[PDB]
C-alpha cells in the first residue's frame, strides 16, 4: 500500500532529523571562535581573457594550473594559456548551447556538453596537432549541466533529466547510472580520491554518491531553492553548495547535515558558482548581482568582493596550486585574480 | 614563445572571422506547447528554405536567422531557459483555441507571465503567435466555445476601437481573439518599461507570413535596441 510506504517514509525522515539533531550539540561558530578572522581579502584582476563572443557558461583549469578551457554560448571552447594570455586552442562546437566543460587531468582531452544532451570529447594531442571530435557520449534525456573527467578513459556527467552518468570513453557506453534526484542536477564535484562525488539538483537537496557501487550514499537537505553549484572541501570530508535562495551552505559528509550558512540581508540573488581555495579557508561564490564574493568559510563572514564583471558571474575556478582564480561571466570575459 | 604567439594570431584571425559570422546571425528561441502548432511552424519554415535541441536555419532578405526548438527537454524550464537571454526574440506560440489540462490558455498565460517577469528574460523581446485562430473561429461560431465560464471578464469585454478585424469575420470571433490578446497584453504591459517588447500576432500553423512576421519583429527589436543605445527611447 502506498499509504503505508508514505507513513514509513515520514517516520524514517523524522528519525533521520532526530539523529541529526542529536549530533548537533556544537555549532561551527563556537568551535571556530579560537580562530581569528582573515580580514578583508583584496584581490585584483591580473589577466582578462578576451575573445569569447557570448556569455561564458563554464571554465575548467588544467592540472598544470596555467592552461584553462572555457566554454561560451557562441559555440566555442577556447583553450587559454593564462600566463601569456595566448589562446592555445579554439574548438568550434557543433552545438552552441554549451553549459559545461571539463579539461582532462592528463590534459590530452577536453569535454563539453549542454542543451544537445551529448558529451563531446576532443583530443588536444592529435598526430596532426589540430583539435578534432574524438568521442560522442549520448544517452542523457536532459540538458548536460556538468561533466568531470575521472581519467583519460572515464567521465562523470550530470543532466537535467535528474540523473548522473559515468561513461567509459573508449567504448562510449554508460558504465554507471545515478538516480534519485527529483530535480535537474545542476552541478557535480569529484572527491579528491575520485571515489565519491556530490551533486546538487533543483530540489533543494544534495546527494553524495559512491562511484563504484552507483548508489546514493548520503542526502543533505537545508537549502530552500534550487542548488546551482557544488564543490568538495579540499580535505574531501565536506562540501559546499550555492542555491537560488541567496545562501551558500557548507555540509559535512560524516555529520550528514549542514555545518555553516553564508548569507547576508543585502544579498537577495542566487549563487551560480562556488569554489574553495587550496587551503579551504576562503569560499569564492559567484552571484547574480554581477559580483563574486569571498566568504570566510570558517567564520561565515564576508571576506572580500570580486567586483569588475559587467554581468552574471556564471563560473569560477581555482588553480590546483592555489595561485589564481579565474572567473567567467555573462559579459563574455574571463578575469584572473590573485 | 614565438611559436605560441604564431598559434595565437592564427587563432585570432579565425576568431575575427567567427565574430563576423556570429554578429550577422540572429538567434531565436521557439517556445510553446507541442499542441500549439509550433512543430507545424518549424516544418513550414524548414520546407521554405533524441536530440536535446533542434536547430533551424533560414534567411529573409539575405539575413540569416537561427531558430532553436527546445525538444527532448523536461517540462521544468526554469533553468535551461536562461540560456536564451541573449537571443533576438522568444517566439512564444499559444494555442489560442485551447480554452475549456482543463484550461491550456491559462497555462500559456502563466508561462508567458513567467517568461515576461524573469530577471534574465526581462531584456528579451517576445514575439507572440496566438496560433489557433482557424480553430478559435470554428469554436466560437459553433457556440461550443463559451469563453465566459473560464473567463468571467469576457462577460463584459468590449472590442477596442483600434482593433482591425479580418475581412468577412464574425464579430464574436474578433471579440474573442482580441480578448485573449488583451489578456496577454495586460500581462506584458505590467512592468514593461521599454527594455523588452511583446509582439502579439494572430497566426495559423500553416501561415506563410510567419517568417516575414518574425523578420519584421526582429528588425523592430534591433532598431529599438539601437535607439535605446542613444537614449532616444
Amino acid at each position, epitope marked *: 500500500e502506498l499509504d503505508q510506504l*508514505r507513513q514509513e517514509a515520514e517516520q524514517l*525522515k523524522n528519525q533521520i532529523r532526530d539523529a541529526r539533531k542529536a549530533c548537533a550539540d556544537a555549532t561551527l561558530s563556537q568551535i571556530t571562535n579560537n580562530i581569528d578572522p582573515v580580514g578583508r581579502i583584496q584581490m585584483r584582476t591580473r589577466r582578462t581573457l578576451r575573445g569569447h563572443l557570448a556569455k561564458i557558461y563554464a571554465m575548467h583549469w588544467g592540472t598544470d594550473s596555467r592552461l584553462l578551457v572555457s566554454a561560451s554560448q557562441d559555440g566555442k571552447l577556447i583553450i587559454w594559456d593564462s600566463y601569456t594570455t595566448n589562446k592555445v586552442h579554439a574548438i568550434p562546437l557543433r552545438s552552441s548551447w554549451v553549459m559545461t566543460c571539463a579539461y582532462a587531468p592528463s590534459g590530452n582531452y577536453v569535454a563539453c556538453g549542454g542543451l544537445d544532451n551529448i558529451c563531446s570529447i576532443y583530443n588536444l594531442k592529435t598526430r596532426e596537432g589540430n583539435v578534432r571530435v574524438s568521442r560522442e557520449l549520448a544517452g542523457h534525456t536532459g540538458y548536460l549541466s556538468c561533466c568531470r573527467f575521472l581519467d583519460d578513459n572515464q567521465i562523470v556527467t550530470s543532466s537535467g533529466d*535528474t540523473t548522473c552518468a559515468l561513461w567509459d570513453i573508449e567504448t562510449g557506453q554508460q558504465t554507471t547510472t545515478f538516480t534519485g534526484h*527529483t*530535480g535537474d542536477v545542476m552541478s557535480l564535484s569529484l572527491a579528491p580520491d575520485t571515489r565519491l562525488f556530490v551533486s546538487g539538483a*533543483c*530540489d*533543494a*537537496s544534495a546527494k553524495l554518491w559512491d562511484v563504484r557501487e552507483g548508489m546514493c550514499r548520503q542526502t543533505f*537537505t*537545508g537549502h*530552500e*531553492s*534550487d542548488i546551482n553549484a557544488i564543490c568538495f572541501f579540499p580535505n574531501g570530508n565536506a562540501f559546499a553548495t550555492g542555491s*537560488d*535562495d*541567496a545562501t551558500c551552505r557548507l555540509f559535512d559528509l560524516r555529520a550528514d547535515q549542514e555545518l555553516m550558512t553564508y548569507s547576508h540581508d543585502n544579498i*537577495i540573488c*542566487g549563487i551560480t558558482s562556488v569554489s574553495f581555495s587550496k587551503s579551504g579557508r576562503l569560499l569564492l561564490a559567484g552571484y547574480d548581482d554581477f559580483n563574486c564574493n569571498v566568504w570566510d568559510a570558517l567564520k561565515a563572514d564576508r571576506a572580500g568582493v570580486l567586483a569588475g564583471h559587467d554581468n552574471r558571474v556564471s563560473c569560477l575556478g581555482v588553480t590546483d596550486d592555489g595561485m589564481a582564480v579565474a572567473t567567467g561571466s555573462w559579459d563574455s570575459f574571463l578575469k584572473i585574480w590573485n | 614563445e614565438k611559436a605560441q604567439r604564431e598559434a595565437n594570431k592564427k587563432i585570432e584571425k579565425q576568431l575575427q572571422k567567427d565574430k563576423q559570422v556570429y554578429r550577422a546571425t540572429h538567434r531565436l528561441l521557439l517556445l510553446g506547447a507541442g499542441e500549439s502548432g509550433k512543430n507545424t511552424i518549424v516544418k513550414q519554415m524548414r520546407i521554405l528554405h533524441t536530440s536535446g535541441i533542434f536547430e533551424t536555419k533560414f534567411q529573409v532578405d539575405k539575413v540569416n536567422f537561427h531558430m532553436f526548438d527546445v525538444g527532448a527537454q*523536461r*517540462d*521544468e*524550464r*526554469r533553468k535551461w*531557459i536562461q540560456c536564451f537571454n541573449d537571443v533576438t526574440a522568444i517566439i512564444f506560440v499559444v494555442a489560442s483555441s485551447s480554452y475549456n*489540462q*482543463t*484550461n491550456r490558455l*491559462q*497555462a500559456a498565460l*502563466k508561462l508567458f*507571465d*513567467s*517568461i515576461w*517577469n*524573469n*530577471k534574465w528574460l526581462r531584456d528579451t523581446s517576445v514575439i507572440l503567435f496566438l496560433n489557433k485562430q482557424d480553430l478559435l473561429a470554428e469554436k466560437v461560431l459553433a457556440g461550443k466555445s463559451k469563453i465566459e*465560464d*473560464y*473567463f*468571467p*471578464e469576457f462577460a463584459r469585454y468590449t472590442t477596442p476601437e483600434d482593433a482591425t478585424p479580418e475581412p468577412g469575420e464574425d464579430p464574436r470571433v474578433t471579440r474573442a481573439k482580441y480578448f485573449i490578446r488583451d489578456e496577454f497584453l495586460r500581462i506584458s504591459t505590467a*512592468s514593461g518599461d521599454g527594455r523588452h517588447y511583446c509582439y502579439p500576432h494572430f497566426t495559423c500553423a500553416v501561415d506563410t507570413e510567419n517568417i516575414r512576421r518574425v523578420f519584421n519583429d526582429c528588425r523592430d527589436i534591433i532598431q529599438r535596441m539601437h535607439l535605446r543605445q542613444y537614449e532616444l527611447l
Partner: nanobody
Amino acid sequence: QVQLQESGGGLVQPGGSLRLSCAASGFTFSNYKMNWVRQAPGKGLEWVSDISQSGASISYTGSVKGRFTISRDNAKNTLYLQMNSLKPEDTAVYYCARCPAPFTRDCFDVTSTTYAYRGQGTQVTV
C-alpha cells in the same frame, strides 16, 4: 527540507462550502509567492490561484473567480483557500505549490508533472 502539507479537504455537497489549509515549513514563507494548483481526475495539473509575498497581489483562474478566496498568514506560515459555491467540476486533488526562487516575480514550473516544491495534495470531492 521544503515541506508543504495540505489538509481540510473532504466530501461536500454541491454548492457547499469548504476550506483548504496549507502548513509550510523549511522555508521563509513570506519571501515566496504561493500557489494553489489542482489535478482533476483524467487531467493534468491545473493552476487555480496565486498570492504574492505580502498578500497584496492576488490572482485566480477564471473558473473560480468570485467562488474561492486565497489568503496567506505569513505569521503562521500557512496558506488558505476558502471554497464557496462548489461545483462537481471542482472534484480534484489540491496541491499547495511554492515556486522556487524568492524575491522573484517569475513563478516558474508550479504545474510541472514532477515539480519539487509542491505538496502532496488533499482530495476535494463535491
